[PDB]
Amino acid sequence: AILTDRYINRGTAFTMEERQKLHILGRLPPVVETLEEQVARVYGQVKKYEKPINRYQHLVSVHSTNTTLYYATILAHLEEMLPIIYTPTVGEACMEYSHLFFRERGVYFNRLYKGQFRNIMRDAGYQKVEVVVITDGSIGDLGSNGIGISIGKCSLYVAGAGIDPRLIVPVILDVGTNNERYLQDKDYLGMREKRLGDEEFYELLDEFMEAASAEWPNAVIQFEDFSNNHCFDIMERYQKKYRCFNDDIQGTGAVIAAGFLNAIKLSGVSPLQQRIVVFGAGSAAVGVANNIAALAARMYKFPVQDLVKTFYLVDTKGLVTTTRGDQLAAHKKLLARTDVSAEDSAKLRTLEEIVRFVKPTTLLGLGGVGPAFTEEIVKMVMQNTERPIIFPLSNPTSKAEVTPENAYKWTNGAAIVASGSPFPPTTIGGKTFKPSQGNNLYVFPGVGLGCALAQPTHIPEELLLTASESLNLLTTEGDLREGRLYPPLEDIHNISANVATDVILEAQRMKIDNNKKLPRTRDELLAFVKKAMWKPVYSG
Amino acid sequence: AILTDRYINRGTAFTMEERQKLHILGRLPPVVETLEEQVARVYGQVKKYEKPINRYQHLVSVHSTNTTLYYATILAHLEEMLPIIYTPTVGEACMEYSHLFFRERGVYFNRLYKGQFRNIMRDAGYQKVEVVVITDGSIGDLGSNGIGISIGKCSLYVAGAGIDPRLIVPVILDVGTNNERYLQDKDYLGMREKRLGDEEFYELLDEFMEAASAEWPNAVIQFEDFSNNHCFDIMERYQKKYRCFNDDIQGTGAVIAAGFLNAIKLSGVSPLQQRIVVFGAGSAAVGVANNIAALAARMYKFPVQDLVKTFYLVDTKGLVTTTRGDQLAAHKKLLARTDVSAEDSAKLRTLEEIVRFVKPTTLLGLGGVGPAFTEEIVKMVMQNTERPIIFPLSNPTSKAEVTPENAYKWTNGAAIVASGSPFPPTTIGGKTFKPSQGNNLYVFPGVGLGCALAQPTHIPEELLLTASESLNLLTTEGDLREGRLYPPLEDIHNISANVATDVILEAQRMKIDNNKKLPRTRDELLAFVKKAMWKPVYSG
Ligand SMILES: O=C(Nc1cc(S(=O)(=O)Nc2ccc(OC(F)(F)F)cc2)ccc1Cl)c1cc(F)cc(F)c1
Ligand SMILES: O=C(Nc1cc(S(=O)(=O)Nc2ccc(OC(F)(F)F)cc2)ccc1Cl)c1cc(F)cc(F)c1
């Protein structure tokens, strides 16, 4: 009842004297290890597997046996482990190996349980739940297998911000699937029917949000991996009534904005002198641009309309302008050029000719349509600025606008680069360069830990902008001198504690915080936040 | 506390009504399956992995979650699953992937715990223990990683004979290792020292046997995978004082003997007309020959000395005779030819010239030294008998004296073949042939179930000979007409119940049985044995 409890089990870290006292002498091999030694052993066990999915499989079995050792291993090898325990391995595990999630505590909803959502939550037997990750499996369709996405995401809040692993709930809202293989698969365990229409979808998701605010009143609700037809609408429906956010939309823009403002500082080319091609004009790409404007307005008090005019949006038609003669979608209107002639708009269609005309100092890659930041385009940006900022942010790694290596080569080390995925360093004439990864892990854990402590009535856009600024300000003079746009990913606990502290102070300034126990001054609150965090060490 | 208990967990086999009553509605995807459907799903999950070791890894995680479903899957796919859940996959898992055994309940002994063996057994918290598999990791050296061999073997008693999975204990006696990689491996968790000398070895193994006979008085002790320097000596030390047997020695000879006597019936060439080359003359090979003689004497009441003269033993020097002029090891003397001249012995060195001289009707491959049953040798056996019996029994599959395919081809379908490993069928002129696998699973489970029910004071050689005869007599007229030497492996529960019944009746005839509750007549006892067996079905 010690060994079989994954929360108190220590395996070989039980001293001989503990083994005797606990009457488990002879249930373990004789070597006594420290946690650090166990982690090094587990690390070698992981690298004994070649395929990511088999590495993940090993780590799931570590989590089932000794949960402390699982988190200790992830934190000691975070950069290397991240692509294994979340994107892109996790989607492939959900799609083909969904059995790897069967043993993980989670909650399955569907229309069959309509009206009983609250009783299912009560029966799940949770104490003071702090974070809930919900998906529908729809940003191929995984349907019910989307539970794996919620599981993987919950685990990053535990690793990243020390959310206690017993106070986090992964949730699948199964509203059906349009995945035709699943609909015909004898082994699919979900609702075998096409996705429900919006009316029934919102009836079930409304019951979910009401039931959770009642049974899990202390929880942050985070939407993960919802398709475009619903993710924006979901936040508009719930942002004010419940304590919720969407990491794909709000986390991404918060992280990119923080890294982008640090790239502006290293460029010496100040924010109002920037000329920014935003390659890709979906709602998310436009959200990222707005988040950059909002952070620059907060950090530097330039008029936001002056920041908005640094942006040149490119959709599939070309430069978005008011004179190009089409009916612009609402999200594109605010960043539309007003200073470009109909005649010039007609000659502003390919990225090459847009770059030649605009003379940008920055390229933001949000296009999702492969490697458009050509050698020729990068060479042009080099005649407008001594430090081109190039952000190939499209995932997966195949969709990326340019490789950091190509960016560094073509600019002979002058490009300031942030990526969506990890990349190895590139060395040019004895000088080393490495892109700064804009990982979402920098923001969501801190937001979840801040909202878990402050208990705000809701998560207004101010708390996300605060987290964005906090992340920006954590990049030290030393980090900046070495070309880093973000604090180091390995220091995620310190990053999360700082982001959480600043999110709390913001909720206090807005008087939406419901926890009166917290300190209200930054130094004392930061110290308090750090002590509240769950640590993967053997405590008792 | 339902889902997390692998003994009562049913997963998707919980009906909706059970889920509601058990307050686990919403802890599972919505599909309700029968056990049979779960097994077919698990089977497809297994075949999603290419490597045996990754298949085993998946099955270990099935056992951890839903133990009923694990055993249901093995029994539905026994022939295919056996090479994955025991030899040869299990040795490779122990050697390189020993972490796959960490979550399995077992007991580790070593010299550090000297004098406390009994308290470790008490503390392990077992009820009426029926079977104990012990190894030292020495038949490469795995040392402590040998625990995986005990684990794999315990699981075959549960699958094969319905030993209740809560009443079986896997044991490693770690007396050190001579594996030099392990002695230098930072991740080895065993005693980091060379194997103990015989005096300290027997002090620890004597304490083991005394402690077990006291704390686990109802148990069968089975020795598994002990090296030749100790396995024979161990049985001589303990056979009369404790309830114990060695499956490598006694199980192998019992299974081979049963299959061999069935091969004699199909050959029509009766036992006293057989001429049997025994290729390989180690203690085990000579044990197999003696077990064949002993079974033929029991089943047919030929004088045993007349059976002994059907055997022609070949060691590395050639035909073992009294005239060949060397000092014969004790085990070889009893099967030594007395009817071969010194002059003929000098010309009886290669297997080819021994086969030409002896004119055997049978070749028994126990040599462990590769494919010595050549096309030329098989062609010669064809001029001495219309049905050559050819038994390439050397493991692994590389050491085998001849492929069943080659045997069937060279004899145009006349060879009667038993193998150590599974082989696919061979088709010759529209006629199908398939070797009968002499798997050890045919005997050890039945012996363990018989000795668990009868509670004999010890396991004399009569009980093994009884099990051997019982297995022989289970091969039906129909099995025999189709060329099978053994009952079908898939019917292992019925085989185990029959072997157990006959072992019990033998212990009753000898008045060594200590359980007075049992029926004493075969039909009533067989019915009773079948009802006692643990079944992998959802019971409650
Ligand atoms: O804790 C148990 N055993 C154990 C633990 C360790 S450890 O030090 O905690 N490292 C460790 C663990 C698990 C892992 O992952 C795995 F299981 F996949 F290999 C990797 C690395 C080392 C050796 C052993 Cl034998 C145990 C737990 C039970 F619920 C039941 C039971 F019978 C034994
Ligand atoms: O029993 C649980 N879940 C579950 C079981 C099944 S099943 O029907 O029992 N098939 C099944 C199981 C396990 C396996 O092996 C594995 F885990 F490796 F995939 C394969 C096949 C299907 C779906 C699910 Cl979600 C469970 C158990 C816990 F201790 C904790 C917990 F949160 C959930």
Angle at B66 between CA B62 and CA B72, to 5 degrees: 80
Half-sphere exposure of A329 (CA within 13 A, CB side): 10
Q: How far is the C-alpha of B380 from the C-alpha of B360, rounded, in Å?
A: 9
Q: How far is the C-alpha of B484 from the C-alpha of B435, rounded, in Å?
A: 8
Question: What is the torsional sign of CA A485, A490, A496, A498?
Answer: negative
- Residues B171 and B86: beta-carbon distance below 8 Å: no
Nearest Cα residue to B63 out of B144, B158, B193, B142: B158
Half-sphere exposure of B133 (CA within 13 A, CB side): 27
Catalytic residue among B70, B153, B157, B238: B153
Q: How many A from CA of B7 to the centre of ligand 1?
A: 19
Tell me whether strands B318-319 and B362-365 are parallel, antiparallel or unpaired. Answer: unpaired
User: Other C-beta atoms within 10 Å of A91: how many?
Assistant: 19
Binding site feature residues of A for a divalent metal cation:
224-225, 248
Point out which residues pair with B379 in neighbouring strands. none
Name the structure determination technique.
X-ray
Nearest CA to ligand 1 atom 31: B103
Between helix A147-161 and helix A78-85 the angle, nearest 10°, is: 160
Tell me whether strands B311-315 and B276-279 are parallel, antiparallel or unpaired. Answer: parallel
Tokens 């700064």, residue located: A436
Q: Phi-psi category of A143—alpha, beta or left, where left has phi over 0 and alpha has psi -120 to 50?
A: left
- For A230-250, b/e burial (b = at least 16 CB within 10 A) is bbbebbebbbeebbbbbbbbb
Q: Is B25 in Cβ contact with A113 (below 8 Å)? A: yes
Q: How far is the C-alpha of A395 from the C-alpha of A404, rounded, in Å?
A: 14
Question: What is the torsional sign of CA B248, B254, B260, B266?
Answer: negative
Q: How far is the C-alpha of A393 from the C-alpha of A406, rounded, in Å?
A: 15
Nearest CA to ligand 1 atom 15: A62
Nearest Cα residue to A228 out of A362, A138, A112, A319: A138
Q: How large is the C-alpha radius of gyration of chain A? A: 24
CA-to-CA dists, residue B180 to A41, A45, A513, angstroms: 19, 20, 62
H helix or E strand, kind and range, residue B134: strand B131-135
- Residues B227 and B146: beta-carbon distance below 8 Å: no
Q: Is B44 in Cβ contact with A187 (below 8 Å)? A: yes
Token pair recorded at residue A390: 């190039």
Q: Is A29 in Cβ contact with B190 (below 8 Å)? A: yes
End-to-end, the C-alpha distance of chain A in Å comes to 14
Nearest Cα residue to A502 out of A449, A438, A457: A449
**Which of B113, B187, B215 would best serve as a mutation to test chain A binding (most A beta carbons within 10 A)?**
B187
Asked if residue A67 has its Cβ within 6 Å of ligand 1, the reply is: no
- What residue type is assigned to position B183 of the chain? L
- Residues B118 and B110: beta-carbon distance below 8 Å: no
Cis link prior to A396 (omega < 30° from 0)? Answer: yes
- For A455-493, b/e burial (b = at least 16 CB within 10 A) is bbebbbbbbbbbbbbbbbebbeeebeeebbbbbbbeebb
User: Other C-beta atoms within 10 Å of B398: how many?
Assistant: 8
CA-to-CA dists, residue A498 to A467, A504, B229, angstroms: 9, 10, 65
Strand, coil or helix: A298: helix
Q: How far is the C-alpha of B465 from the C-alpha of B459, rounded, in Å?
A: 11
Token pair recorded at residue A285: 């790409």
A63, A67, A71, A76 alpha-carbon torsion, rounded to 10°:
-90
Q: In chain A, how long is the greatest CA-to-CA distance?
A: 86
- Residues B401 and B279: beta-carbon distance below 8 Å: yes
Ligand 1 atom closest to Cα of residue A29: 25
Query: Å from B28 to nearest chain A CA?
Result: 6
Q: How far is the C-alpha of A271 from the C-alpha of B257, rounded, in Å?
A: 89
- Residues B275 and B311: beta-carbon distance below 8 Å: no
Token pair recorded at residue B217: 């008085």
Nearest Cα residue to A170 out of A243, A235, A222, A110: A222
User: Other C-beta atoms within 10 Å of A370: how many?
Assistant: 10
Q: How far is the C-alpha of B29 from the C-alpha of A144, rounded, in Å?
A: 7
Q: How many A from CA of B101 to the centre of ligand 1?
A: 8
Strand, coil or helix: B289: helix
CA-to-CA dists, residue A364 to A101, A295, A408, B273, B457, angstroms: 36, 16, 16, 90, 82
- Residues B328 and B337: beta-carbon distance below 8 Å: no
DSSP for A102-119?
A: TTS--EEE-GGGTT-HHH
Q: How far is the C-alpha of A402 from the C-alpha of A369, rounded, in Å?
A: 11
Ligand 1 atom closest to Cα of residue B105: 32
Q: Catalytic site residue A48?
A: no
Strand, coil or helix: B297: helix
Number of continuous H segments (helices) and E segments (strands) in chain B: 24, 14
Alpha helix segments (H runs only) across A322-364: 330-333, 342-346, 351-358
Ligand closest to the CA atom of residue B56: 2
Q: Is B96 in Cβ contact with A187 (below 8 Å)? A: no
CA-to-CA dists, residue B286 to B7, B183, B258, B315, B350, angstroms: 43, 35, 16, 11, 19
CATH class of A11-249: alpha beta
Token pair recorded at residue A141: 């369709």
Q: How far is the C-alpha of A112 from the C-alpha of A99, rounded, in Å?
A: 23
Measured in residues, chain B has a length of 540
Tell me whether strands A436-437 and A416-419 are parallel, antiparallel or unpaired. Answer: parallel
Q: Reported resolution in A?
A: 2.1
| Chain breaks after residues in chain B, where C lies over 2.5 Å from next N | 138, 139
Tokens 């700082």, residue located: A498
- Residues B351 and B377: beta-carbon distance below 8 Å: yes
Question: What is the torsional sign of CA A223, A224, A225, A228?
Answer: positive
Strand, coil or helix: B78: helix
Q: What contacts B350, CB < 8 A, 6 or more positions away?
A: B318
Nearest Cα residue to B110 out of B197, B204, B225: B204
Q: Is B58 in Cβ contact with A187 (below 8 Å)? A: no
- Residues B393 and B418: beta-carbon distance below 8 Å: yes
Q: How far is the C-alpha of B487 from the C-alpha of B480, rounded, in Å?
A: 9
Q: How many A from CA of A26 to the centre of ligand 1?
A: 13
Query: Å from A96 to nearest chain B CA?
Result: 9
A29, A35, A39, A42 alpha-carbon torsion, rounded to 10°:
20
Question: What is the torsional sign of CA A261, A267, A272, A276?
Answer: negative
Q: How far is the C-alpha of A93 from the C-alpha of A51, rounded, in Å?
A: 12
Nearest Cα residue to B167 out of B136, B130, B207: B130
Q: What contacts B355, CB < 8 A, 6 or more positions away?
A: B277, B363, B377, B380, B381
Q: How far is the C-alpha of A352 from the C-alpha of A314, rounded, in Å?
A: 11
Q: How far is the C-alpha of A30 from the C-alpha of A52, rounded, in Å?
A: 31
- Residues A175 and A142: beta-carbon distance below 8 Å: no
Token pair recorded at residue A47: 């690298």
Q: How far is the C-alpha of B379 from the C-alpha of B384, rounded, in Å?
A: 10
How many residue pairs bridge chain A and chain B with CB atoms within 8 Å of each other?
A: 120
DSSP secondary structure letter of residue B247? I
Nearest Cα residue to A220 out of A228, A231, A210, A212: A212
- Residues A534 and A164: beta-carbon distance below 8 Å: yes
Nearest Cα residue to B401 out of B366, B425, B430: B366
Q: How far is the C-alpha of A225 from the C-alpha of B252, rounded, in Å?
A: 57
Q: How far is the C-alpha of B439 from the C-alpha of B251, rounded, in Å?
A: 9
Tell me whether strands B107-109 and B389-392 are parallel, antiparallel or unpaired. Answer: unpaired
Strand, coil or helix: A20: helix
Angle at A303 between CA A302 and CA A309, to 5 degrees: 100
Token pair recorded at residue A480: 């900046």
Ligand closest to the CA atom of residue A11: 1
DSSP for B453-473?
A: HH-BSS--HHHHHHHHHHHHH
Q: How far is the C-alpha of A64 from the C-alpha of A105, rounded, in Å?
A: 11
Q: How many A from CA of A145 to the centre of ligand 2?
A: 13
Measured in residues, chain A has a length of 540
Angle at B83 between CA B78 and CA B86, to 5 degrees: 95
CA A77 to chain centre: 18
